[PDB]
Design a protein around this ligand. Sequence first.
Ligand code: G6P
Ligand code: G6P
Lengths: 366, 366
Amino acid sequence: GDKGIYRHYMQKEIYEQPNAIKNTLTGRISHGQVDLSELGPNADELLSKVEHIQILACGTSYNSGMVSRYWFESLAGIPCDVEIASEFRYRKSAVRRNSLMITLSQSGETADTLAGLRLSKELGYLGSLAICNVPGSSLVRESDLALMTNAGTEIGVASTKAFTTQLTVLLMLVAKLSRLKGLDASIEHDIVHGLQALPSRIEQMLSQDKRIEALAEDFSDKHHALFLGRGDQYPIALEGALKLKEISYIHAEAYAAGELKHGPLALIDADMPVIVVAPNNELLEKLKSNIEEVRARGGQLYVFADQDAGFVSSDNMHIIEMPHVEEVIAPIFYTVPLQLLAYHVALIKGTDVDQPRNLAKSVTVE
Amino acid sequence: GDKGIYRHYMQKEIYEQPNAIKNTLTGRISHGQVDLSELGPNADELLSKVEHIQILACGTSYNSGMVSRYWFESLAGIPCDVEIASEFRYRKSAVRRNSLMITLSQSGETADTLAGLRLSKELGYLGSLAICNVPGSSLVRESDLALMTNAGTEIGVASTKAFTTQLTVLLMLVAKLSRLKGLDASIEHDIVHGLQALPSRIEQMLSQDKRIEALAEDFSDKHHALFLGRGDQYPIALEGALKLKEISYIHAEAYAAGELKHGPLALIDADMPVIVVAPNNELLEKLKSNIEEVRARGGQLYVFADQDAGFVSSDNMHIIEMPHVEEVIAPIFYTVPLQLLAYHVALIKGTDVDQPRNLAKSVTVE
Ligand SMILES: O=P(O)(O)OC[C@H]1O[C@H](O)[C@H](O)[C@@H](O)[C@@H]1O
Ligand SMILES: O=P(O)(O)OC[C@H]1O[C@H](O)[C@H](O)[C@@H](O)[C@@H]1O
């Protein structure tokens, strides 16, 4: 509700991430294990029956659900599908056996999300779980179960702490289910350690702010941007492109890194910088070769990478080294630099960061 | 292998669609019912067991698989998932019970697609079915079952007839399965009638070519484009944006129509025309209201719609009326105008239509 020393609520909300994550973790971690005994006593009975997870959401909330799909399939071994809420509500879907329905929403009032929830009641889902940041909102009220993110009020029109806290809460849910399915307890312990390290990995990332401010200068006069990512980082490229669209009004688009050659490579020139989010060596090798093909048009590659990968900048390949981080929380960590990049580009251009043109905090009407 | 009267192979391949579809239909339609007795005798046993379908593909082939997902869930009631081949092959996925693996590929040699196929062998899929246009290619050779599209050789680097014939073949597969699951035989009959009408609906669409040529003039000097679609037409918006990227080098991006307000609306101006693919009245109402919000920046909406919807152009809303078509084949029909739009924009700009910069017919190497 107040900015304090910050210039914008969105800036304040980015900087509040360490603390918002600490608050979402509070009480759910008990003895190196996840404690979701707030869902009620019957909770475990339901969760244990789940054979499929369906997530519905819109905007930035869809981006978090997409990250979580990688986590649910690889860590808890449970099949997961994520769908844009507006798409789900207008089509005839095939219901999955013992499917749990999860809705993600900062506001809990998004019309298409609520609509998908309700429709789901008539379709045979085992039950519904709402992950939301606003207590007692419609989605919270009509869902069977609810896990609040507890990030505090988010005023900026573009979501920041609500996204990182949603990813934290989904990661807790992945841990709990890996357990109920009786998977190696190592899986839950790695997640819990990663989560315990999270708040200071982010304070660690906030300290590179001046380096991101400097990079923003290179993007401030561009009209296009391409964000690339593979696996759990693909959705982070999605959120990064969305943030550049939202507050800087640059036509930034995200693409799966393996698809660069199937289309977008023909577009790359000096006016369309390419950003890659945490690639491994094998992926970097491929992308370096692709950017070489567009060197005559001035294509440049900007790479956010772990210092430990030992990558070196070249003339059209710029490594932006980042502190090493635990693999499980990497997608949450790499979001921060992309939130700050969009914020600094907006500050240079002087655009309305807290109320970007034509956008709204929650679309509560159809 | 030869152009004849055509200026480019891609033009020739677009015009060949009626005939390529006739050839893919030949022998698979017997008595108002689909005849897939080429898959072998055991075929029906397998297909009958399928409880889930997983599709893998890259580029334009992913766009067709995405259309088919709407069809499989709503018409045959079977759960379907479509994934970019490069993403599937680098992650740990949760295998689904009695999942059938389908790969889509014009060339049958795409490295990431082949890789996903092979990995799938080690993962517990009930079996594999390849939909491909090149007989005896790797994907064909290593798959359990195979349905050839029979569109003939495709030389243009960007796919046209291979896409429309893949959609035809998937629609035949949806019919066959609605039957094996014992669903109303109406479903198969509607599909078969739609398919029988298809070849001349397309010859019908090819006759509007001069109207598309005229529309291309409005796009020829633009640097961005936004393509919108809902449901089975969303993937058609994906292919339309991909074609503008591929041969005209315009930064065209596709978006689910319901997500316009969640981001991209802040970008719209005179340099970013918005195209909507076959909206219904309720969707048009919403989009008209959104474009009104960006009228001061010159946002324009171009709508490809059925003449029968009775929509009327306004100052910033241009209806491009199209002949009425059967609902089931609508996604295939609406692809044609978008292929021709990209082609005419490329002809005006004088870009290398058959060999667009930095692109290749099949990416056979990693
Ligand atoms: O997360 P929800 O409250 O459901 O809202 C979904 C989306 O709505 C609006 O578009 C906001 O500007 C976005 O930040 C948000 O992601
Ligand atoms: O369909 P495939 O042969 O698997 O190829 C997938 C993609 O590869 C290349 O990028 C072609 O230029 C595209 O037209 C095609 O969709």
